[PDB]
């Protein structure tokens, strides 16, 4: 063959992954610098590297199933998950496959059992190799550099295993689809225990507590006057809250809180949506009022309107225990709210506002901040696995007949467009935790005492903020250093432009830079954790929450039966997909906020700059503060009606990778 083919003959992806892994340890010995403080050789090299980065990290707004959302055109080799994440994730998926196959009719399970057994054995073998390599490294630290190649080869093996897992899952889903009171909603769990919510789901106080301690703590807002389209009367309010209370005094005393799902748009179809796989489905854009008692101990649900127009949707009011003719209509109205909730939570709060925001910051960072830029060094750990998991969301979860088409009532094209639109409209500054709390008038613990997301979230927000401030102060001596940084300027430009981050604006000083970095890091780590990790314990049991109902909203508060409510429950296929996807997505904890070490071998420090890593220095102070936050949250959870554990720093990954 031609002599110019010589370099291509033996070139392969594994070899290149090894090179990428070793080069990253080597590059990381370069002391970080702002471009204006770098020497000319450094300026030349960093500009060359950034130009090459743009070949690898490429924007598109036409990615499959997420049209209009800025995405990576493809995931670079160096952005594939490391073997630690691959093993964890493969472990969970294989466990779930084995569990599901065990519940299938024996004849239909025979071949899947054998294949699943083989995959489980291969996974165990891979785990054993991982353990043996780690042991080798501990026993001979001097050989760590050469052992890295064996970890890269193990990565190849686990990638191959997960490819085989993918083929099996596709076959199992087809078989399941052909095959498939409340017993069926327990049966889909197989060997898995029901989540805690299965015990409490019909309780009204539990239902209200979701608004401040559930997967979507962002929608609830204080109201000073009821909306014109929510015509609840004084008599209705007194029936629930007492003869000596009133709407006027509850409003004035900051005791009224509203959930209004108007923003769902096409995620709340106007009527029935018939699909071949799942039959007739419905979802809703309801309005619900909650109130604190005069002692402010906790929220109670007061009233629910199952749609936006009161002319066509009657008012459901919380019934007394004796009012058996109102009991089931009320359960149905709460189900309407929970259906809206899964749509709002998963498509907006989780997918659009964590995952799809962090996608843009990852791409901008890699394309415009040199690897030797201190902000690249800081931010990159917070995007580990983000491009990969988001390509997975688009390719695997969002196509026709996939998990989201099954589990969410709307037509899949409407779901995609509405989630994408929500991402495009999400204002970066307004979406900051403190701004969100203030805008919704839920920031004052005197007004609303029990709001665990706020109280724990602010501890984590403020810890990150002080870290960002300390870190910025190491590199930027003044606002002039901020505006003179041409890489930061390009980064801001890419975030505004190609990244389509609403509300993003030029960064002109250190205080603003700190706020921006706080939000980027918080969004990647804590916010994602708070809205992702409740999935297994709160969202796996369909009668407590599901993004589709098999029946319309109740047409009357009076006269409904248990049968009427049961008709809202989803088909078994929806319940099966739900338990499995939500167990998976909340069962992989990879990396930890504040650790700042590689999450794969050789687990090296992220930071080489002695000013950052000094004893008692910025990083140590951040880590110490997170440990104080952990203690404070653990103490709070001893006093709370139920523990809220999603913002414990020990359970917050550094990045959005699941
Ligand atoms: C739902 C709302 C989510 C909202 C937001 C989500 C955002 C981010 C999450 C994105 C997650 C992306 C998907 C998961 C990522 C898992 C890690 C991963 O990347 O795995 C890659 C493998 C192979 O890839 P490949 O392209 O070769 O072939 C895909 C199938 N043709 O994919 C899977 O095993 C699919 C598992 C699907 C889950 C099955 C559940 C367990 C099966 C048990 C039996 C099921 C019986 C029914
Ligand atoms: Cl269809
Ligand atoms: Fe997630
Ligand atoms: Mg058998």
Descriptors:
binds magnesium ion; binds fe (ii) ion; mainly alpha; binds chloride ion; two-stranded antiparallel sheet; 5-stranded antiparallel sheet; 55% helix; 9 strands; 5% strand; binds the ligand CCCCCC/C=C\CCCCCCCCCC(=O)OC[C@H](COP(=O)(O)OCCN)OC(=O)CCC/C=C/CCCCCCCC; 658 residues
Overview of the structural elements:
With 658 residues, the protein is mainly alpha-helical. The protein has one domain. Helices cover 55% and strands 5% of the residues. It is built from 26 helices and 9 strands. It has helices at 6-9, 13-27, 40-56, 83-103, 106-139, 144-179, 183-187, 197-200, 204-213, 234-241, 247-252, 324-368, 374-379, 386-397, 403-407, 412-425, 433-439, 452-475, 479-483, 486-496, 510-532, 535-538, 562-566, 572-585, 610-613, 618-639, and strands at residues 59-60, 71-72, 221-222, 256-260, 273-275, 279-281, 287-292, 299-305, 315-317. Strand 7 (287-292) and strand 8 form a beta hairpin. The protein is globular, with a radius of gyration of 26 Å. The protein starts with 5 loop residues before the first helix and ends in a 19-residue tail after the last helix. The relative contact order is 0.13. Bound molecules: ligand ZPE, chloride ion, fe (ii) ion (FE2) and magnesium ion.
Distance between the termini: 45 Å
DSSP helical segment count? 26
Number of strands: 9
When the domains are counted, the total is: 1
Order of strands in the sheet with most strands: 3-4-7-8-9
Largest sheet: 5 strands, antiparallel
